[PDB]
Design an enzyme around this catalytic site. Structure first.
Site, PDB file in Angstrom:
ATOM      1  N   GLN A  97       0.847  -1.187   0.000  1.00 34.93           N
ATOM      2  CA  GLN A  97       0.000   0.000   0.000  1.00 34.93           C
ATOM      3  C   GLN A  97       0.887   1.242   0.000  1.00 34.93           C
ATOM      4  OE1 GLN A  97      -2.368   2.070   3.131  1.00 34.93           O
ATOM      5  NE2 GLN A  97      -4.177   1.324   2.013  1.00 34.93           N
ATOM      6  N   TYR A 183      -5.913  10.890   3.497  1.00 36.46           N
ATOM      7  CA  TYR A 183      -4.523  11.132   3.080  1.00 36.46           C
ATOM      8  C   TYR A 183      -4.524  11.960   1.788  1.00 36.46           C
ATOM      9  CZ  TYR A 183      -3.770   8.046   6.948  1.00 36.46           C
ATOM     10  OH  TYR A 183      -3.780   7.469   8.200  1.00 36.46           O
ATOM     11  N   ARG A 230      -7.462   1.858  -3.004  1.00 36.42           N
ATOM     12  CA  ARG A 230      -8.330   1.917  -1.836  1.00 36.42           C
ATOM     13  C   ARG A 230      -9.000   3.264  -1.751  1.00 36.42           C
ATOM     14  NH1 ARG A 230      -7.834   0.193   4.676  1.00 36.42           N
ATOM     15  NH2 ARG A 230      -9.265  -1.532   4.304  1.00 36.42           N
ATOM     16  N   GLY A 320      -8.674  -6.519   9.340  1.00 34.64           N
ATOM     17  CA  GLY A 320      -7.588  -5.779   9.980  1.00 34.64           C
ATOM     18  C   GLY A 320      -7.190  -6.331  11.330  1.00 34.64           C
ATOM     19  N   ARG A 321      -7.935  -5.971  12.366  1.00 34.49           N
ATOM     20  CA  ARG A 321      -7.538  -6.361  13.708  1.00 34.49           C
ATOM     21  C   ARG A 321      -7.533  -7.870  13.944  1.00 34.49           C
ATOM     22  NH1 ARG A 321     -11.469  -1.894  16.143  1.00 34.49           N
ATOM     23  NH2 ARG A 321     -12.528  -2.631  14.242  1.00 34.49           N
TER      24      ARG A 321
HETATM   25  C1  LIG Z   1      -3.741  -0.516  13.838  1.00 34.90           C
HETATM   26  C2  LIG Z   1      -4.444  -0.170  12.541  1.00 34.90           C
HETATM   27  C3  LIG Z   1      -3.709   0.378  11.498  1.00 34.90           C
HETATM   28  C4  LIG Z   1      -4.292   0.710  10.274  1.00 34.90           C
HETATM   29  N1  LIG Z   1      -3.493   1.189   9.274  1.00 34.90           N
HETATM   30  C5  LIG Z   1      -4.039   1.399   8.020  1.00 34.90           C
HETATM   31  C6  LIG Z   1      -3.228   1.697   6.910  1.00 34.90           C
HETATM   32  O1  LIG Z   1      -1.961   1.691   6.946  1.00 34.90           O
HETATM   33  N2  LIG Z   1      -3.851   1.914   5.717  1.00 34.90           N
HETATM   34  C7  LIG Z   1      -5.207   1.848   5.567  1.00 34.90           C
HETATM   35  O2  LIG Z   1      -5.692   2.104   4.439  1.00 34.90           O
HETATM   36  N3  LIG Z   1      -5.989   1.494   6.607  1.00 34.90           N
HETATM   37  C8  LIG Z   1      -5.422   1.245   7.821  1.00 34.90           C
HETATM   38  N4  LIG Z   1      -6.221   0.804   8.837  1.00 34.90           N
HETATM   39  C9  LIG Z   1      -7.582   0.284   8.482  1.00 34.90           C
HETATM   40  C10 LIG Z   1      -7.540  -1.219   8.156  1.00 34.90           C
HETATM   41  O3  LIG Z   1      -6.926  -1.435   6.876  1.00 34.90           O
HETATM   42  C11 LIG Z   1      -8.910  -1.898   8.061  1.00 34.90           C
HETATM   43  O4  LIG Z   1      -9.693  -1.238   7.057  1.00 34.90           O
HETATM   44  C12 LIG Z   1      -9.697  -1.998   9.339  1.00 34.90           C
HETATM   45  O5  LIG Z   1      -8.799  -2.427  10.362  1.00 34.90           O
HETATM   46  C13 LIG Z   1     -10.805  -3.034   9.093  1.00 34.90           C
HETATM   47  O6  LIG Z   1     -11.616  -3.197  10.227  1.00 34.90           O
HETATM   48  P1  LIG Z   1     -11.349  -4.438  11.190  1.00 34.90           P
HETATM   49  O7  LIG Z   1     -10.061  -4.164  11.945  1.00 34.90           O
HETATM   50  O8  LIG Z   1     -12.578  -4.355  12.075  1.00 34.90           O
HETATM   51  O9  LIG Z   1     -11.266  -5.690  10.319  1.00 34.90           O
HETATM   52  C14 LIG Z   1      -5.652   0.474  10.051  1.00 34.90           C
HETATM   53  C15 LIG Z   1      -6.396  -0.072  11.126  1.00 34.90           C
HETATM   54  C16 LIG Z   1      -5.807  -0.397  12.351  1.00 34.90           C
HETATM   55  C17 LIG Z   1      -6.652  -1.057  13.412  1.00 34.90           C
END
Ligand SMILES: Cc1cc2nc3c(=O)[nH]c(=O)nc-3n(C[C@H](O)[C@H](O)[C@H](O)COP(=O)(O)O)c2cc1C
Length: 363
Positions: A97, A183, A230, A320-321
């Site tokens: 990304q 961003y 994205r 994600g999490r």
């Molecule tokens: C610790 C953390 C860091 C994240 N960093 C990014 C990132 O670098 N780029 C981005 O587009 N989204 C980022 N997000 C969003 C995640 O890509 C993702 O869309 C989100 O965690 C999805 O929800 P879930 O954690 O409930 O699955 C981040 C989320 C978390 C929790």
């Protein structure tokens, strides 16, 4: 259907359980350099249908968070080559990304200690993450940005283009352009952050101009089937709303993206604090307009993923999490096993603890 294969541009994912892009802020400074610890973390998660990396700087100017990696220097390229090799040794696939943070940044980590750049000179009114004198993550108010001059825009496009060339050499399978989450690309897309009066502001055609120039540049540099994007075009993300015509403007952008024949469209549907869910009618309008893979994200459960994939509305889900906490999330979901508990206090910064120490089902 979650455990069935999917063609994603130039690669084939063996399942639809993708690792979302996750900023973890564990890179080396000085140099914004990926590490062997990061390599281990990604290698652990190589059974994902597709890994999408943490957001990664296209240039030094792109930096907004202390500890986030770049893909602009020789040392960064060499370090990423090792990381992609480890994923490939385990038969995984990995996308990088790429971002420019624009106004979600702080002068202290910008070239020259100067103000960060954006579409317009408007503060984000939020926080970013820096490091203190002991290297620990701290939250700091964002610096008011400088509006880019018209003559600086080509350089931004070129920085995306060069970062994609670098990604190809570093061994990534795909690139994901971060046009979401407030961003730089999203700062141009949104009328709330973009008050420009030249050809990059005003009408939706003008607000989408930068992102489409970037898409065209990177498709030309590599291949359209290597490029994903994205977006987070419905709702509010990091204080950036999508303006008063968000659905129409989203569908305009998606119709334009479709013309480029790109590998995928990744929709971040809500931020962590939540929001209104996407309607099935909106999902159908997105399908009408986009002819590649659609990835959904935002607090999905496997149940919701199966429901929407089975209904033919999306193709894959990025978790994600659950991926932070479960390196073998694919196997756990496939076997209906319990998940490891999350430790959110170690999501950002630090070291191996809360990063590489979440176990698989079996050792
Ligand atoms: C610790 C953390 C860091 C994240 N960093 C990014 C990132 O670098 N780029 C981005 O587009 N989204 C980022 N997000 C969003 C995640 O890509 C993702 O869309 C989100 O965690 C999805 O929800 P879930 O954690 O409930 O699955 C981040 C989320 C978390 C929790």
């Amino acid at each position: 259907k979650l455990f069935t294969p999917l063609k994603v541009g130039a690669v084939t994912a063996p399942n639809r359980v993708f690792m979302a892009p996750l900023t973890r802020l564990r890179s080396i400074e000085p140099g914004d350099i990926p590490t062997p610890l990061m390599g281990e973390y990604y290698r652990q998660r190589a059974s994902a249908g597709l890994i999408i990396s943490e957001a990664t700087q296209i240039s030094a100017q792109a930096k907004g968070y202390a500890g986030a990696p770049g893909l602009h220097s020789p040392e960064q390229i060499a370090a990423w080559k090792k990381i992609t090799a480890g994923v490939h040794a385990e038969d995984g696939r990995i996308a990088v990304q790429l971002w420019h943070t624009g106004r979600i940044s702080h002068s202290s980590i910008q070239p020259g200690g100067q103000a960060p750049v954006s579409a317009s000179a408007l503060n984000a009114n939020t926080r970013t993450s820096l490091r203190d004198e002991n290297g620990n993550a701290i939250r700091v108010d964002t610096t008011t940005p400088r509006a880019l001059e018209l003559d600086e825009i080509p350089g931004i496009v070129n920085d995306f283009r060069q970062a994609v060339a670098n990604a190809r050499e570093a061994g990534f399978d795909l690139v994901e352009l971060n046009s979401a989450h407030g961003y730089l690309l999203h700062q141009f897309l949104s009328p709330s952050s973009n008050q420009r009066t030249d050809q990059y502001g005003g009408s939706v055609e003008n607000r989408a101009r930068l992102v489409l120039e970037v898409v065209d540049a990177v498709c030309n540099e590599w291949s359209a089937d290597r490029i994903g994007i994205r977006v987070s075009p419905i709702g509010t993300f990091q204080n950036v709303d999508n303006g008063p015509n968000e659905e129409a403007d989203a569908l305009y952008l998606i119709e334009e993206l479709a013309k480029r024949g790109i590998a995928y469209l990744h929709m971040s549907e809500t931020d962590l604090a939540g929001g209104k869910p996407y309607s099935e009618a909106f999902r159908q309008k997105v399908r009408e307009r986009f002819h590649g893979v659609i990835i959904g994200a935002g607090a999905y459960t496997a149940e919701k993923a199966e429901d929407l994939i089975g209904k033919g509305l999306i193709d894959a889900v990025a978790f994600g999490r659950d991926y932070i906490a479960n390196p073998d999330l694919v196997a756990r979901l496939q076997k209906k096993a319990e998940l490891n508990p999350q430790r959110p206090e170690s999501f950002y910064g630090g070291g191996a603890e809360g990063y590489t120490d979440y176990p698989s089902l079996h050792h």
